[PDB]
Structures are given as C-alpha cells and as structure tokens.
Amino acid sequence: GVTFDDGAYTGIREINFEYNSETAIGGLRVTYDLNGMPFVAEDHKSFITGFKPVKISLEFPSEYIVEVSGYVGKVEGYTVIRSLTFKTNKQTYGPYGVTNGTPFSLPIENGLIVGFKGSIGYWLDYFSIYLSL
Amino acid sequence: GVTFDDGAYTGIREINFEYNSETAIGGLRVTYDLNGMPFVAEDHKSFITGFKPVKISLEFPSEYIVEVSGYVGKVEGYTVIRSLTFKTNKQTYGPYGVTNGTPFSLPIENGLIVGFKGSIGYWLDYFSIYLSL
Amino acid sequence: GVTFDDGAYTGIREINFEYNSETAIGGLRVTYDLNGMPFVAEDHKSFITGFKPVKISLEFPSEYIVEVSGYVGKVEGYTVIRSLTFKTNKQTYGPYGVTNGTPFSLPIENGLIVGFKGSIGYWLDYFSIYLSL
C-alpha cells in the first residue's frame, strides 16, 4: 500500500476511519491537537470504496486514549488490520471491523498518543503510534 | 504587554523579530517546522513601530540554535529584553538591540528549542523557551 | 504474585530470566545501564524452581532491543506470560518458553526500553515496559 506519516503533535481530537464487516479497516483521517488548536491531518484513503465510516470525537482536555487494540488477519491473501478498538479514560469505542485473526494491543499505563503513521492499500496494512508525555 | 504562547513544534525554520538600536526588542514571529513542513506561527506585534526587522533563516535540518543570550534592562521604566543573540551550530546571528543591562544566557549542551512564549507591549517584556529532544 | 517495579534507567546491558518448555516464564533479573555504569536491579524470583535460565548479554550502545514479543496463556488456571522473544538490532534471542496462547508484541520504531515492572508468582504474571529517548 501507500505509506503515510502524520508526525507528532500535542494530542488527539478526532479519529475518523473506515471499516467493512466482511473485510478490514479502510482509510483513516486523524485530527490532532496542536498547542490548543486543531490540526486536521491528511486523509489517508483506501484504494477502494464500500466502507462504513466511524467518527470518534474526543472531549479534548479531559478525554484521551488509554489503549488501542484490534485484530490482524488475511484478506485476499494480504495481512492487514481487520478490526480496531479505541479505549479512552471515559469510554470504549467498541470493536469496528472483523474481529478474527491475531489480536494485538497497545495499552498505555502512562503517556499520550500524539501521532500515527502506517500504510494503506485496499485496507490498513499496518500502523505505528507516536508516544509522548 | 500582551502575552503569547506558540506552544511546541518539531523545530525552528525561521525567526523574524524587530529591534531598535536605542530602545529594545520589539515584535516577534517564528516559523517552526512541523513534521517536515513549515508552520508560520502568529505574529506577536509591538504596540509601536519604528523598528528594524531582522530575519534569521536557519537551514533547518542541519542548522539549529545552540545558545540564546541577550540583555535585560529598563526602557521608559519598563524591564524588557533589550538585546538578543542567537548562536547556531553554523554561525552567530550577532547582537541585535541594546547590549546594556543584565546579561542572560541559555546555552544548550544537548536538546533543541521547539517553541517560544512570552509577552510584548511596546517591547519584548520577557520570554520563555520550550526544550525537547 | 509478588509485584515489582525496577523504575527507569539509561539503557539495558543484560536480561536474565527463567523459562520452562512445559509451563511458562519464571523469574527475571535485569542489569540496566545507569549513566554509563552497570546497575544490577533486584532479582524477581519465581515461587518455585525447575526452570532453564537464559542470559541475554547485550553489547550495550551498539546493541539494543527493538522488539519484545511472546505468548500469554493459562497454566494451572493462571494467565501468565508463557513465551518471550527479544529482538535487537543485531540479532534475535529466539523464543523461550511455550509459544501457545494469545500472542503479543511491542516493536519499537524509535526509542529505548529503559525499565521493567510487573508481577511474578510461580510464573511471570504480567509486565510493563518503560520507554524513553
């Protein structure tokens, strides 16, 4: 797929992404907090369509992600992120996508997610997370 | 004066500021680097004019500030930054302003300036520096 | 089991731990680097014996851990870490233990592991990792 790297900011305000109950995670677009104001990062689009969008708006300040988890599995032979779950200190934005395959998780005891990077073809191939205090 | 706080970024690309050979430092505007691309911060204006602007254009990646120094003194009874000198790993952007009063200096052995905050009325009242690896 | 928290240091010089091909991970003892000198942290022992010790001696500065992974599972009804694999920028200290159950991984694109915390009873119940630049 095509790689992307949003870089690092001061926090997360919104996470919008696509998913398909039969395949995997699609495109992704993150809005970060940059010193008290929002910074809408570039939209990282899937090569195809037919997805269901989900928009997670966080109550800035008070609300923040404490754990990212999901499932990794094969679709059309490719190993991609099939499911995602974002747990914050306020609530859980339940599983989205297909929860089959190999589970993964990044629970954060202390620190904050301040950026995302990865690769997207038809689906989210992989992704990494920027962490900071 | 009017306080300001640019917050933190990934580096410094350009620093534009005013100075008067008879009084002190005036307004300030910094162009930071934000994940590989410029980010022009807000222009922090002096209440007055009659200044000499200086534009320090750093060859970003390779060039970075290793020491900020200057003088603090009184102008019209107000304690302000009267002079500033920025030393990079490539060169020194000579004294600008009135080098009279109490000297101050922030030599940086390891680390990077990634942001500025402070206050400006007729002149730069004071300022602080964000440091980060 | 008994909880432990080594705290943070400046790097890792050596990792000693126990494992049993039929059960899970046992005790763990880390030798950190503290400002250039070795610092042998507390030995966190298993409540029992019958394990096969392994001593991962890293070539501190040039060599460092880039990924920690393994398997989580149940043994005698307790959910514990059953397998561990430490990958560095030089080599992979192959899987140790029982590679069955639910996999997990913490690959590190940038940064360093500078501390461990967790709990140990008959086996390693769980653990967390300190990260830093």
């Binding site: - | 990934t10 390779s62 | 990260l131």
Partner: peptide
C-alpha cells in the same frame, strides 16, 4: 545531531 525533534514510536502492528 540535527535540528529535528525526535519522538518515541512504537513499532507497527499488522505487518
């Protein structure tokens, strides 16, 4: 080093 601030990044998931 260079004038670029560094960040901690935890490896990719999904290969």
């Amino acid at each position: 080093r260079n004038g670029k601030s560094q960040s901690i990044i935890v490896g990719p998931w999904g290969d």
